[PDB]
């Protein structure tokens, strides 16, 4: 489970195409920590847009 506080009136980015490499293509950058059956950790990334 993950929870995050967001801004109701946060401006939507003007860049319509969504890409990971861009900086202002998202509103918030997050991460997810998981471990597999063999003890390796994968850092899943979560991005929030409007």
């Amino acid at each position: 489970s993950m929870q995050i506080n967001l801004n109701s009136t946060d401006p939507v980015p003007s860049k319509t195409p969504f890409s990971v490499s861009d900086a202002d293509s998202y509103n918030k950058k997050g991460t997810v920590t998981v471990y597999d059956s063999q003890g390796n950790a994968h850092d899943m990334n979560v991005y929030f847009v409007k």
């Binding site: 993950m2 995050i4 506080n5 967001l6």
Partner: protein
């Protein structure tokens, strides 16, 4: 050579009031990496708990 992380993620209890900016408040998972016993402890309630 490890299994793909097949997990379910929930976003329940979300609040979006003007609380300043975007910030994460809670993050956890049950994917506990293997660990070894460090010490054993006994509570005042009689239940012995390992660490």
């Amino acid at each position: 050579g490890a299994t793909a992380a097949t997990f379910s993620l929930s976003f329940l209890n979300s609040m979006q009031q003007n609380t300043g900016a975007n910030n994460i408040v809670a993050t956890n998972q049950n994917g506990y990496k293997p660990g070894d016993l460090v010490s054993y402890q006994i509570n005042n309630d009689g239940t012995v708990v390992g660490n």
